[PDB]
Amino acid sequence: KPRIPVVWIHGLECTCCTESFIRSAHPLAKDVILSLISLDYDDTLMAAAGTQAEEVFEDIITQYNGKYILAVEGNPPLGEQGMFCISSGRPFIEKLKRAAAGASAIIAWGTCASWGCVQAARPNPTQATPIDKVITDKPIIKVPGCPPIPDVMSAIITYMVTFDRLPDVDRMGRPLMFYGQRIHDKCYRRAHFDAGEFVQSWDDDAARKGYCLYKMGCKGPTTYNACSSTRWNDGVSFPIQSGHGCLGCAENGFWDRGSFYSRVV
Amino acid sequence: STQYETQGYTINNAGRRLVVDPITRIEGHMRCEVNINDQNVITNAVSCGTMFRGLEIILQGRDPRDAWAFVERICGVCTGVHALASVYAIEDAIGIKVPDNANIIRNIMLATLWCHDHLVHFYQLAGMDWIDVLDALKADPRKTSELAQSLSSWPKSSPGYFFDVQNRLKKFVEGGQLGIFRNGYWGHPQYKLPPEANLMGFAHYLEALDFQREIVKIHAVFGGKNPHPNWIVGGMPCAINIDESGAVGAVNMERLNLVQSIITRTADFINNVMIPDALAIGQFNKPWSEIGTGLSDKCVLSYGAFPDIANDFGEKSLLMPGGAVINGDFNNVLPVDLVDPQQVQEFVDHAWYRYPNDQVGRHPFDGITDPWYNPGDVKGSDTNIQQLNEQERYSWIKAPRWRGNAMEVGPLARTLIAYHKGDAATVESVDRMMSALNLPLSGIQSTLGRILCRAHEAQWAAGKLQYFFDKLMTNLKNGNLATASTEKWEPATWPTECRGVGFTEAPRGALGHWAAIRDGKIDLYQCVVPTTWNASPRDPKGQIGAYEAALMNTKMAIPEQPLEILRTLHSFDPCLACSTH
Numbered sequence: 109k110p111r112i113p114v115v116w117i118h119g120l121e122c123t124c125c126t127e128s129f130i131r132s133a134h135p136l137a138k139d140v141i142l143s144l145i146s147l148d149y150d151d152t153l154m155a156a157a158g159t160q161a162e163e164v165f166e167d168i169i170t171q172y173n174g175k176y177i178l179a180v181e182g183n184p185p186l187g188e189q190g191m192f193c194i195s196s197g198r199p200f201i202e203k204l205k206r207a208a209a210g211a212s213a214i215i216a217w218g219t220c221a222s223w224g225c226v227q228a229a230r231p232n233p234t235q236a237t238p239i240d241k242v243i244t245d246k247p248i249i250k251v252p253g254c255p256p257i258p259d260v261m262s263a264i265i266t267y268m269v270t271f272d273r274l275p276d277v278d279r280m281g282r283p284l285m286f287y288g289q290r291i292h293d294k295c296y297r298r299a300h301f302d303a304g305e306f307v308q309s310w311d312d313d314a315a316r317k318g319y320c321l322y323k324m325g326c327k328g329p330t331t332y333n334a335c336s337s338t339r340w341n342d343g344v345s346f347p348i349q350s351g352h353g354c355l356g357c358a359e360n361g362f363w364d365r366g367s368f369y370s371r372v373v
Numbered sequence: 374s375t376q377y378e379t380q381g382y383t384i385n386n387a388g389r390r391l392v393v394d395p396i397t398r399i400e401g402h403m404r405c406e407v408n409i410n411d412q413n414v415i416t417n418a419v420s421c422g423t424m425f426r427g428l429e430i431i432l433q434g435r436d437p438r439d440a441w442a443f444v445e446r447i448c449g450v451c452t453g454v455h456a457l458a459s460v461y462a463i464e465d466a467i468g469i470k471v472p473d474n475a476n477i478i479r480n481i482m483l484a485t486l487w488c489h490d491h492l493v494h495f496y497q498l499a500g501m502d503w504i505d506v507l508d509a510l511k512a513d514p515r516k517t518s519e520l521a522q523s524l525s526s527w528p529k530s531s532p533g534y535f536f537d538v539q540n541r542l543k544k545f546v547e548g549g550q551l552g553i554f555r556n557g558y559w560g561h562p563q564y565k566l567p568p569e570a571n572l573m574g575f576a577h578y579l580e581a582l583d584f585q586r587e588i589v590k591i592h593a594v595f596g597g598k599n600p601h602p603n604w605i606v607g608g609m610p611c612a613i614n615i616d617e618s619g620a621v622g623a624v625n626m627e628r629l630n631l632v633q634s635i636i637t638r639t640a641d642f643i644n645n646v647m648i649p650d651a652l653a654i655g656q657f658n659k660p661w662s663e664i665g666t667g668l669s670d671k672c673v674l675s676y677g678a679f680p681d682i683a684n685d686f687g688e689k690s691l692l693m694p695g696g697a698v699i700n701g702d703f704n705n706v707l708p709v710d711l712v713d714p715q716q717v718q719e720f721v722d723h724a725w726y727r728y729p730n731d732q733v734g735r736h737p738f739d740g741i742t743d744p745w746y747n748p749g750d751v752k753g754s755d756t757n758i759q760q761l762n763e764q765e766r767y768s769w770i771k772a773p774r775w776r777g778n779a780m781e782v783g784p785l786a787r788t789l790i791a792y793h794k795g796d797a798a799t800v801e802s803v804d805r806m807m808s809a810l811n812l813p814l815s816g817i818q819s820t821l822g823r824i825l826c827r828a829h830e831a832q833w834a835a836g837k838l839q840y841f842f843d844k845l846m847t848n849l850k851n852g853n854l855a856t857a858s859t860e861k862w863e864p865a866t867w868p869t870e871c872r873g874v875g876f877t878e879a880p881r882g883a884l885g886h887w888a889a890i891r892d893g894k895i896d897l898y899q900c901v902v903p904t905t906w907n908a909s910p911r912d913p914k915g916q917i918g919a920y921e922a923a924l925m926n927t928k929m930a931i932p933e934q935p936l937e938i939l940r941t942l943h944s945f946d947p948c949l950a951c952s953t954h
């Protein structure tokens with residue numbers, strides 16, 4: 109049976125979301141690519157380069173016009189006529205718009221594509237802009253996080269393939285399944301928060317007993333994600349479990365809400 | 374057209390111009406242009422970074438304790454290495470010493486990155502330049518099994534296994550949905566592996582794609598998550614508790630047991646899959662020991678890495694040697710000082726940035742990141758580059774030099790430095806490796822050599838993982854559990870004005886972060902990253918960087934199909950997000 113065509117493009121980014129994707133434990137990324145979708149264009153993994161890659165891009169968006177999913181990693185810069193990010197000699201934004209026009213729906217992977225992430229932090233030298241500010245006529249599913257959880261990425265993929273539909277979303281376009289609740293509302297250290305049992309400085313007796321990281325600047329109370337339930341890397345850990353407060357990395361403008369070590373207001 | 378001489382090369386932009394944009398199977402955005410002569414030989418090469426984000430600008434005004442988190446996002450492929458450089462730099466500026474366990478865990482984080490990054494590069498990035506995936510469909514599964522078993526003790530080698538892999542590829546291809554294999558260079562005369570070796574390599578590509586996910590569980594234990602683990606100025610946040618109440622809330626014996634199981638499996642896979650495959654690529658592609666030499670027989674650079682004595686970054690402490698060779702004089706390995714303003718300098722006369730005087734290079738403590746998109750007279754327009762003008766500004770990458778010399782960095786560079794400083798393990802390993810291929814030592818200074826050194830390094834790093842883990846366990850047995858120093862955590866304890874350098878060897882080569890702190894905030898933060906060195910554009914003397922030099926003089930069999938270009942570029946493992954930051 110034919111597999112659903114997927115075009116994956118990259119703007120200004122660090123590639124962590126692509127890296128997170130291939131960490132998937134179930135299904136393995138190998139099995140997603142071989143059996144679940146047809147990953148028809150992807151700069152990180154494809155054999156073809158240059159004019160050969162351009163030919164694949166053109167061929168796929170033409171042949172499957174209206175029928176492919178567009179995955180976007182990173183974002184377009186509006187500064188310097190878009191030439192902070194250049195693809196085939198032209199502004200990345202042109203490639204974004206062309207790919208978006210033929211897509212049935214768009215997945216905005218990561219805080220970059222969803223909101224802006226680090227390049228959009230003050231003073232945003234390139235005028236990096238999230239996808240939904242440029243593409244205004246297409247369904248966009250935001251999957252934020254820096255990067256999002258590997259098995260969250262693959263679970264969203266398998267949901268769409270299995271149920272033949274987009275996941276239901278909150279008012280910001282995030283899948284309710286994984287972004288409906290706060291880190292702090294499923295945090296295994298919540299008992300300590302409620303008891304007033306806090307780490308006060310690194311490696312103190314409190315830290316060695318796994319006490320709450322609130323006074324160390326944990327942004328769990330204002331951050332929506334699955335990290336404290338689904339956890340990371342096949343359920344091995346998450347930021348808080350390994351001793352560091354949540355940075356807020358799934359939330360819009362998290363880089364610019366004061367120091368990571370200042371308390372939630 | 375124009376012609377000039379530099380570094381033993383004749384740079385000639387006469388003849389047919391070829392453009393490769395996008396470069397794929399790299400991180401980030403790169404454009405390459407070459408000119409070829411009537412013999413289809415490259416006479417000019419142009420390396421262009423086609424992205425910029427401006428982390429050096431963004432870091433201004435941040436709390437120095439927060440810096441690692443921002444700069445970690447320079448790159449998701451070499452994830453963690455910028456956070457390490459950052460905490461080193463801030464600690465150097467403020468005057469902070471970390472506890473021994475923190476240093477050991479940081480070394481573990483780095484060695485884990487080396488293993489992961491090198492493994493995935495070999496298979497997922499460079500692999501398809503050497504392995505003809507479609508040609509695997511012609512392989513005899515029994516002959517493939519026999520080949521695999523002649524090269525390695527790796528268990529997974531049955532004829533039925535190779536038949537299953539082949540059949541899966543066959544069904545994948547049959548429907549016409551070739552995905553990442555579409556419009557590839559399959560059948561190119563430079564693909565030299567027999568069908569059985571293509572099927573073996575493709576099977577291993579899939580095994581590596583599965584396995585790589587397990588390696589990073591080490592980052593998850595100590596750093597919470599991968600990609601983008603967490604760190605702190607003063608050590609690491611992963612407090613240890615082995616034998617007291619509350620060990621369920623810390624790094625305990627079960628967590629350490631997990632780490633040990635990953636280390637063993639990581640060494641096993643690298644030693645028995647990647648190493649034999651790299652040697653096999655060597656055996657079937659020996660002419661590539663003479664292609665893509667570039668600067669590797671002229672100028673190479675390592676800062677050194679893995680300080681084994683906590684807080685000591687001197688020669689006696691670093692397990693990975695630093696030093697510089699220039700003018701092809703490998704008998705004189707030179708000491709490197711990252712504070713010396715006459716050593717590391719960056720030029721922008723051929724890059725998209727403003728300096729008050731673009732004819733001079735600036736040490737990073739005097740660095741300036743003032744972006745200026747000005748491509749001059751391309752064929753095309755400002756928003757439609759048909760041909761970059763390499764006589765003027767052509768890249769978002771700055772041009773680093775060392776004492777005014779253009780240098781190669783990375784696994785080959787490091788190997789040559791260690792070999793020539795007389796590191797006994799390196800000499801023995803290199804000599805044995807070239808002997809196995811019946812090639813002279815000079816054969817390492819090539820595109821093939823870069824690949825062989827990278828594999829050797831993955832083996833070296835997997836061994837060091839065990840070494841560091843044992844070091845950690847030894848401290849624990851002696852009741853030494855400390856993972857953070859907090860004496861100078863509070864801004865009130867810092868010097869009002871100070872500056873520091875954090876350096877290491879990232880998977881792709883020499884990495885430095887230069888930071889100045891004033892009044893509790895980042896006053897300046899300048900990065901010079903390994904791919905910045907290698908993918909560098911030209912300087913005021915017209916000297917070419919490692920990529921451009923490595924491409925020079927290269928024969929192409931079919932100009933329209935840039936396989937030889939991709940082979941040599943991919944051999945450096947380009948990370949474009951790193952190069953531009």
Ligand code: SF4
Pocket residue numbers: 291292293295296297298299301319320321322326327328329348353354
């Ligand atoms: S560690 Fe963070 S998310 Fe968990 S209970 Fe404390 S403040 Fe909430």
Ligand code: FCO
Pocket residue numbers: 448451454455879880881882884902903904905948951952
């Ligand atoms: N390795 C790596 Fe990334 C680059 N270049 C860094 O630092």
Ligand code: SF3
Pocket residue numbers: 121122123124125126181182217218219220221225226253254255446449
């Ligand atoms: Fe996966 S590219 Fe990495 S920076 Fe924060 S999401 Fe962006």
Ligand code: F3S
Pocket residue numbers: 253254291331333335336346347348353354355356357358598
């Ligand atoms: S920093 Fe990000 S990874 Fe999860 S725990 Fe916080 S949202």
Ligand SMILES: [Cl-]
Pocket residue numbers: 116117118119151195
């Ligand atoms: Cl793209």
Ligand SMILES: [Cl-]
Pocket residue numbers: 219223224225226228359360361362363
């Ligand atoms: Cl953001």
Ligand SMILES: [Li+]
Pocket residue numbers: 386762763764
């Ligand atoms: Li020119």
Ligand SMILES: [Mg+2]
Pocket residue numbers: 429771899900901902954
């Ligand atoms: Mg820089």
Ligand code: 3NI
Pocket residue numbers: 400447448449450451452948949950951
């Ligand atoms: Ni990188």
